[PDB]
Amino acid sequence: GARSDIDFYLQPTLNQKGVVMIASNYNDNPNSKEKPQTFDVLQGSQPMLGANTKNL
């Protein structure tokens, strides 16, 4: 399902039961496309590493 411009960055390890992926999306669109206040927000999680703490 991917496309031909993702530029898969591979950094292999040795002692790693499992394999972890990090998906990032730079904007790179030329209209306006600014970041909202780097999300100093207690309600929302910041959209770089979510650290999801939720059941309710």
């Binding site: 309600q43 929302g44 999680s45 959209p47 979510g50 999801n52 309710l56």
Partner: protein
Amino acid sequence: KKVVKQKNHVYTPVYNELIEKYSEIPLNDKL
């Protein structure tokens, strides 16, 4: 005759939202 409530006429991406926020309960009426 009955209509079928035709058109709102403006379009958008759907975006079932990715980044989640904690949902505090706003049942704070007077007390």
